[PDB]
């Protein structure tokens, strides 16, 4: 046999690949790019005021933030129509933007008594157990009163320094600039960004009715306890009103067919595991199917969890003078994309099983497979030295370089050096004794010696495989 059985097993895979490709082409269009590009350039690439050149992307002080919040921010939220506020005369600013603050309390840490004459207070780094909850300043509104995480429908964020909660002191802004500017001025006069503040969030969203794509915008600013400002941004093109055009029904039908295909595969895998050979995991061709089906079922579960959860849109459509809460939907969309992008990768990778249709491809596959059993040991022995260099660099230079400021950053820096991108022109300033020594040793031992065993093993394996397959003709 081996032919009349594989032909069905091949066409069933080809149809699966076609459906997956249709889905991938469907979700990713070419209109999201320019949408997000203009949306980002409107807020990030514009100076706070015409008399300086410090944009939100390069904030450096607590004072610059106030210049930003009344400035390039208000100028890019409210556009006078030739009341509603269309950003680019196409994008609709639905709802109102909301600002929020996360801060810690006075006396959150301890100082020694021998120098407790000059140090009058300390503000410890942000922690859920050290977060202030008392009302400060003038106790008028929601901007000076703590609010629990469940009363804001919020969640965690996982910023750059730490993972911030969903609570804090929040404030909703108006619809016209005339009142939003007054509110911001009121916040700035009665000092609101004190020394105790640790994080600030700004959130809003737009519609852009021409195409059907919501865009949710979040801006984070972090204040480390050691001083400084760290900005971050996130623009997400969500889509929530899918069924309008025929292509949408086409995509839904392809999704249904995809679910049917994955159900078929899981059934034929359970049948094979139970009604046939047990513990068939020494193949790498069946350990790939389980990964694909698990990733697919996780993606389907996430889609069912998220798509069926859209009542927040209905609540916003009831009254459209309140802040819409679309933060969870963007997070789940990001998670769904991160899963689909890996699923399609493995689906494409699986195609290698189907290419043995002549001598050359078969022998290349044999060489590639036989060369994996022994490359594994050298890969481990090489990665051990790689991590040794990584930890050495992290311990030595990981305090002044900022390219080695984190372990994974050290790994990426080493890989970039391997590609030939990073030069040590700053390492001497970082260190003059152990800098050039480390650089020379790394670029000599792991680029002239260690990196050639990979070539040697492959070269020898291919040579012996070809010689064996040629000798396989002296017997026949």
């Amino acid at each position: 046999k081996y032919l009349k059985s594989v032909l069905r097993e091949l066409v069933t895979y080809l149809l699966f690949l076609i459906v997956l490709c249709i889905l991938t082409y469907g979700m990713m269009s070419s209109n999201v790019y320019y949408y997000t590009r203009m949306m980002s350039q409107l807020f990030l690439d514009t100076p706070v005021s015409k008399t300086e050149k410090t944009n939100f992307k390069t904030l450096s002080s607590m004072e610059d933030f106030w210049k930003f919040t009344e400035g390039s921010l208000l100028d890019g939220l409210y556009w006078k129509m030739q009341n509603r506020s269309f950003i680019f005369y196409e994008n609709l600013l639905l709802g109102v933007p909301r600002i929020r603050q996360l801060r810690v309390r006075n006396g959150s840490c301890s100082i020694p008594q021998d120098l407790r004459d000059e140090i009058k207070e300390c503000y410890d780094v942000y922690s859920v157990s050290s977060e202030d909850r008392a009302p400060f300043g003038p106790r008028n509104g929601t901007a000076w009163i703590y609010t629990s995480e469940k009363d804001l429908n919020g969640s965690s964020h996982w910023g750059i320094i730490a993972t911030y909660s969903g609570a804090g002191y929040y404030l909703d802004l108006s619809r016209t600039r005339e009142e939003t500017a007054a509110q911001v001025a009121s916040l700035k006069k009665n000092v609101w960004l004190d020394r105790g503040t640790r994080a600030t969030f700004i959130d809003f969203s737009v519609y852009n009715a021409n195409i059907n794509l919501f865009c949710v915008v979040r801006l984070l600013v972090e204040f480390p306890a050691t001083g400084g400002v760290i900005p971050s941004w996130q623009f997400q093109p969500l889509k929530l009103i899918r069924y309008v055009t025929t292509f949408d029904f086409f995509l839904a039908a392809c999704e249904i067919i995809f679910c049917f295909f994955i159900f078929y595969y899981v059934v034929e895998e359970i049948l094979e595991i139970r009604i046939h050979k047990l513990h068939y995991f020494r193949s790498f061709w069946n350990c790939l199917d389980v990964v694909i089906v698990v990733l697919s079922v996780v993606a389907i579960g996430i889609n069912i969890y998220r798509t069926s959860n859209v009542e927040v849109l209905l609540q916003f459509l009831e009254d459209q003078n309140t802040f819409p809460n679309f933060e969870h939907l963007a997070y789940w969309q990001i998670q769904f994309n991160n899963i689909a992008a890996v699923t399609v990768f493995f689906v494409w990778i699986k195609l290698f099983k189907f290419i043995n249709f002549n001598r050359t491809m078969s022998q290349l596959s044999t060489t590639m497979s036989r060369c994996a059993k022994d490359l594994f040991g050298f890969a481990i022995m090489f990665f051990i030295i790689f991590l040794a260099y990584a930890q050495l660099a992290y311990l030595v230079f990981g305090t002044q370089v900022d390219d080695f400021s984190t372990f994974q950053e050290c790994i990426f820096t080493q890989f970039r050096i391997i590609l030939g991108d990073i030069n040590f022109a700053e390492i001497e300033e970082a260190n003059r004794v152990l800098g050039p020594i480390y650089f020379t040793t790394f670029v000599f031992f792991m680029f002239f010696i260690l990196l050639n065993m990979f070539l040697a093993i492959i070269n020898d394996t291919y040579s012996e495989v070809k010689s064996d397959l040629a000798q396989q003709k002296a017997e026949m």
Partner: peptide, 29 residues
């Protein structure tokens, strides 16, 4: 006479390293 602290998120690397060493030595042994 008991407490479920869960106060912070700053992990203590000493216990993690000790446990990792104690399991790695067991595996190799």
């Amino acid at each position: 006479r008991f407490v479920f602290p869960e106060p912070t998120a700053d992990v203590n690397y000493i216990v993690m390293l000790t446990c990792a060493v104690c399991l790695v030595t067991y595996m190799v042994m």
